């Protein structure tokens, strides 16, 4: 799921590095996540944890060994646009569409380079 | 390069278990090939053998270990069509056209029985 929302966020974001460029960004890019979003992109990661969480409750995703981030399923990048494959079963087809959602959230809203490495006294 | 290529063919003919119903089929489906391919559908296997020698010279492909069918790629089958992700690196991309285009061949050829685990005492 990690390399493969890595590969999405690429997709959308060409230039970017996503796991240099959002991993430790506000308050929820990141392990975890508690406290308000401190901006918009931080708020596509907060949905992104929910999303993962929500999958969790999924007993096809139980079914599974992983950190939530090695449910690794299938999609393709053709033209900046992601399509989520109809060969994923279910907790996987789950984790793809919640991996696309933030994938497309990260590229629609604005980067803050404060909120990178954000000092999380007091998220 | 296999798993992704029985998933493409299922995304082409949903009703099918390729590695069961395709493989060992004529002269050309299945592990080598020679002789003249007995119909069309053998025809599409001796081009997809000929896509993958094409493939091996490559030395993008060359850099890896696999059997020519663990040239491992990304794609999705969305609505039974196949697109091969931007993803892919030239070698996987390769592969991937290679297979994209023999699960379409066997969507559009007769089947026939008959060369089902056809006695190869002259191919
Ligand atoms: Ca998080
Ligand atoms: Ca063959």
């Known amino acids: 799921a990690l390399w493969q929302f890595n590969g999405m966020i690429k997709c959308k974001i060409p230039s970017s590095e996503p796991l240099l460029d959002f991993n430790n ?3 929820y890019c990141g392990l975890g996540g508690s406290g308000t979003p401190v901006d918009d992109l931080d708020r596509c990661c907060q949905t992104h944890d929910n999303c993962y969480k929500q999958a969790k409750k999924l007993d096809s ?23 989520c494959s109809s ?27 404060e909120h990178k490495n954000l000092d999380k006294k007091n998220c």
């Open 87 to 113: 060969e994923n079963n279910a907790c996987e087809a789950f984790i793809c569409n919640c991996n696309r959602n933030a994938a497309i959230c990260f590229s629609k809203v604005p980067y803050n380079k």
């Open 25 to 27: 960004y506000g308050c």
């Open 61 to 83: 995703c139980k079914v599974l060994v992983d950190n939530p981030y090695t449910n690794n399923y299938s999609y393709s990048c053709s033209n900046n646009e992601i399509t």
